[PDB]
Design a binder for these strands. Sequence first.
DNA 1: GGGCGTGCCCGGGCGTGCCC
DNA 2: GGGCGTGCCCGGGCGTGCCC
Lengths: 200, 200, 200, 200
Amino acid sequence: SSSVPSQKTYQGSYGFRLGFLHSGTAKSVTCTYSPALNKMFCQLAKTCPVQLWVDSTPPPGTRVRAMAIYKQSQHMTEVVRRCPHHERCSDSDGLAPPQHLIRVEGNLRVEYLDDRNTFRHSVVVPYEPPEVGSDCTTIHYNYMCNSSCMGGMNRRPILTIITLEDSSGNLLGRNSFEVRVCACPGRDRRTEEENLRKKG
Amino acid sequence: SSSVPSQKTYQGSYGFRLGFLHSGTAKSVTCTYSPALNKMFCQLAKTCPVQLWVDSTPPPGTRVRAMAIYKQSQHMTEVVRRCPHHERCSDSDGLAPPQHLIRVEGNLRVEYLDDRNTFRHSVVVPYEPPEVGSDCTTIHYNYMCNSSCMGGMNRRPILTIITLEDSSGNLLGRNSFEVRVCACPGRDRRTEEENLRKKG
Amino acid sequence: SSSVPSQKTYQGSYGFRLGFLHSGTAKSVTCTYSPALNKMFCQLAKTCPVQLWVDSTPPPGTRVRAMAIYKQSQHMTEVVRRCPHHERCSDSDGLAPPQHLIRVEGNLRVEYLDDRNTFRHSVVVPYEPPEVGSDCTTIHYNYMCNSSCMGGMNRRPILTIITLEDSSGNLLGRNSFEVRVCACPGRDRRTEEENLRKKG
Amino acid sequence: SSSVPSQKTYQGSYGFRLGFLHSGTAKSVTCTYSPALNKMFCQLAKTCPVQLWVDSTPPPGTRVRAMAIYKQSQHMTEVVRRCPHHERCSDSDGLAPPQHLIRVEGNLRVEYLDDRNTFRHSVVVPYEPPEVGSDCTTIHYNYMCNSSCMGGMNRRPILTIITLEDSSGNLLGRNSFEVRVCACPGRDRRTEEENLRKKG
DNA sequence: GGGCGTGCCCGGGCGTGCCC
DNA sequence: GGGCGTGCCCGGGCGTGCCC
Ligand SMILES: [Zn+2]
Ligand SMILES: [Zn+2]
Ligand SMILES: [Zn+2]
Ligand SMILES: [Zn+2]
């Protein structure tokens, strides 16, 4: 009955977890991940590689959904949307609706969804197993507004929720991470990690 | 025959109690809870998360009702309503009647009720059990006037009464807490707790 | 073309000016006037005597209009109205519309007007010459909200504009004074006069 | 043939100049004017009083037009518009089109225009002579975006151009001033004046 | 990569109807 | 008449995209 999707980690019976590349903290690196904060820092529209790791092979027809929600209780019930400026920037790839924050690049089977009851946006691709000898699959996500965008996220932190779902709709696994989209991911990761150590 | 709902705690056979988040006492925090006073301090229209804890699973069709009453004997028999200024502010979410003080956000099955005999307002949502691994459910309430509003609460303290009711109308459990809606919940919580220690 | 009436003093060819009684500055005096501030301090709904002085007798059919405007440039274009709480208090004398801030008591020929283009309220009585041996006429005004009323004046200072008008509509004279309606006119007059001396 | 209106001062045969109120430089004053910079600093949507001074009375039917242009050569040819976020904020007064940056408040004869060839916006009111004894007329303007608004002014300075025009369209006079719309006009005026003194 | 923006967060303290 | 309320004003200082 809640209109807020759950963020609770559920690694589930398939041993589902996420992985992130090691990029560093150079000032304006395009994408970097803080394990201490479970938080991805990235630039607007840049590639954000997310690895999907499983211990057991999901069944055929499994899907991978990504959605954003506001992290703070005060904002959770508000749908995460692109700001009006970027919604009109005509920067679509021909498939993503202009209002969707999260896109997937490099996938011929991407689907963009708007929930008819909650109005929330999500992007789905088929789950594909790793190639022989590889331990994970990688999806390239893109975030199409800065966290600071006026009339959109407006400086509020978001979580991305990644769910592994079978074709019937059963939740097989769920993981999430915080996101800041910003001009200087390396600067901002280092600032937030230092504030955690000094004041957290 | 009384037109005043009971505030008596009834944890009942399901072991029903409330829980509140730890927010601190920063001057203008949006919502904070004092265990010593059993009192929530929050800002107008801001999210107030309330956790529902049970020891035994309620039956299907159970409902959660919230209602406000004035705390002091002198004012108990007066219906708690929004003040005339805020009633006309056209700030409805499309479901809550403009006169109702307490709203629920983020729930697709909210129902707003006016008692035909007492004229008192209440807001009801279905009870949903916690997700596996979680110990409680959380409802987001909003209070749509300040305690100080002239022509409404007019500086008088209120209690929020939360009842767990089966579909037939049986009371399964009841809990309550005092509320102050104010501009500076952290200041005011600290003032009230200090006055309790010094003069209570 | 402006929707804001002029406040410019125009003593005019009849030598029109206002006079006020000497009341003192006892804490909760019902009405008191500060010449230094050209400001009347009064309590809600209490009698405020205003004297009309002329050097030459106005023609028959002359009228006396009172209107309120906000003093600050930022608020001048907003119509001064009673707040929603007091508008519903059913405290009318049978003639004053419930939304009008300024009333006249003790006059059998009072007229309450709403301007069809600016929506502003005014109250009008016939001008009557002083009795033989007297130098002025007195009108008893009442202000039906406090300056602090939420959803009304909301702590903003107002001016009352008194105009002497002939029956044809010509402006014969205009005077104005600031008003604060408050619980403690004597306290507040003394505070404002001291602030003028110390910080003005 | 140019699509950029001229900003050249033309006090003209009527001796047309502008005047501004003395407000000070308190940090968040709603509006303040720097003579040294010929620059108004104001908050979003707040009243900005502008005085019109003439030496000779303009003919009947004279109009007062206000328009914004970007100050820097690099941006002059771009039409000044509200940003997409504020354009959708449904904050219209019922007359101003939602895309127009400059509004006039308190005038029953305001007209909002879009030039059919340059697409530029302007707002026009009738010229009214000062009341007897007064030396100027005052118009209340409002600026409906911050200078910093993303997708609108985007941190770029603008000029407001005020023209006095006869009913036939002849330019009788022209004046202009720079504008910054910001959260803290007093801070920002002081910063800009200090930078002028130290680095200009 | 260093450092300036600039809307907004933050705690100190003044209001002002009402309690005493 | 003395003095406590309590929403809001106020200046200090942190953001964060962008200039350099
Ligand atoms: Zn954006
Ligand atoms: Zn209220
Ligand atoms: Zn009132
Ligand atoms: Zn804008």
